A paper describes a structure:
In hyaline gastric lesions of aged 129S4/SvJae and B6,129 CYP1A2 null mice, pseudo-CLCs were found to consist of the closely related CLP Ym2, which is a protein mainly made by epithelial cells under the influence of IL-13. In parallel, we produced recombinant Ym1 and Ym2 protein in FreeStyle 293 F cells. Spontaneous crystallization was aided by low pH and low temperature (4 °C). Native in vivo isolated Ym1 crystals and recombinant Ym1 crystals as well as native in vivo isolated Ym2 crystals and recombinant Ym2 crystals were crystallographically equivalent, sharing the same monoclinic space group (P21) and unit-cell parameters. Thus, recombinant Ym1 and Ym2 protein crystals can be generated in vitro and are biosimilar to native Ym1 and Ym2 crystals. (C–E) Structural superposition of the X-ray structures determined from a native in vivo grown Ym1 crystal isolated from the BAL fluid of mev/mev mice (C+E) (yellow), a native in vivo grown Ym2 crystal isolated from the BAL fluid of a C57BL/6J-Tg(CAG-Gal10)Bla mouse (D+E) (blue) and a recombinant Ym1 (C) and Ym2 (D) crystal (grey). The low root-mean-square deviations (RMSDs) establish structural similarity. We showed that recombinant in vitro made Ym1 and Ym2 crystals were structurally similar to crystals isolated from mice and to each other, and when administered to the airways of mice, crystalline Ym1, but not soluble Ym1 protein stimulated innate and adaptive immunity and acted as an adjuvant for Th2 driven eosinophilic airway inflammation and immunoglobulin secretion.
Although mice do not encode Gal10 in their genome, they do form pseudo-CLCs, made from the chitinase-like proteins Ym1 and/or Ym2, encoded by Chil3 and Chil4 and made by myeloid and epithelial cells respectively. Ym1 (encoded by the Chil3 gene) and Ym2 (encoded by the Chil4 gene) are CLPs belonging to the glycoside hydrolase family 18 (GH18) and are unique to mice, with no known human orthologues. However, Ym1 is mainly expressed by macrophages, neutrophils and a subset of circulating pro-repair monocytes, while Ym2 is produced by lung epithelial cells, which could have discrete context dependent benefits. Ym1 and Ym2 are among the most strongly induced proteins in the airways of mice after allergen exposure and both proteins readily form pseudo-CLCs in vivo.
Residue numbers in the entry: 0 to 374
The structure:
Amino acid sequence: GYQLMCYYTSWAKDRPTEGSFKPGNIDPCLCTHLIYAFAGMKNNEITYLSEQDLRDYEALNGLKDRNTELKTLLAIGGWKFGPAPFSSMVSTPQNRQTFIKSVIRFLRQYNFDGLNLDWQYPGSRGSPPKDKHLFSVLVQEMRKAFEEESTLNHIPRLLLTSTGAGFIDVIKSGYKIPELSQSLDYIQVMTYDLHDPKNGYTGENSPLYKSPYDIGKSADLNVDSIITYWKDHGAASEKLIVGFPAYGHTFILSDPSKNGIGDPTVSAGPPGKYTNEQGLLAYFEICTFLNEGATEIFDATQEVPYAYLGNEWVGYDNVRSFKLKAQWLKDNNLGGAVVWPLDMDDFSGSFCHQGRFPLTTTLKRDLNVHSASCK
């Protein structure tokens, strides 16, 4: 079958009033895997960062009592964390063993089924070129240690996944694709955040295909090109998990009458009421934007929507774009999808009136997600 992985972010519960979403309220039958963002690191060991995280782990893993086939993964890293803790940890065999041993202990004591590595990124952002090789060594050693622990304790092996960059230059400087594909269970490809406001033009967050004005390096800023790059450079199709964002990016239009894709912008758009991130809106916040009168366009060239009201423009994903991408990933024999983050889908059903988790429910249906337990 297909996997449907779903992130829960620790900060989702701290959004105000109706934006607050707690992990215990995830539907246990919606996803095949839940990924908790994030663990941190201390003295080359994985760790939690707040006692509240431990309450989240209890709630998240408690969902496995309702869907006994559900798996949980603990993610370490992310953009904000950056590369430096990973560079230090991979730099010596001793530090890698300290880390690997801590991961086995931590995942087993907190009832997680596996680890998601999310180093952003080996070989860039200050991480030296040697980290492309040392990341591959870390992943091989982690996979071997997981195999050994499974044999020792006669229990199913811990899963090992990694994020994979969506920008071709970052992929080249960071990832030994054939070796990583050998040792990882899955590669979660970060097919999102594809147009940043630095360029000064509106662009889609996760278009399936290129726009006619995407020239040169921009021609690869789409899901189809990125996944093709990973496969062309030796990744196993069935191990690739495509990133499906449950949010969009916002822009301020230079001219409110020039409101298409590729039109000039002034800056990123303002933070939303609930998510409070400059240049981003959750899908549930975009439903409000639409309800408040934004003009909604489905761009068939890129197979994604955008919407605008006054000088605010948002490029995002909706039920239709998720449906078209799900058909494309089945047609391309991919491993499945990861919803980043589940907590920005309309978890309550109150913002969009499309039922609970409308984006993710679309993927569950169209990827035929099921397990023995949920029947």
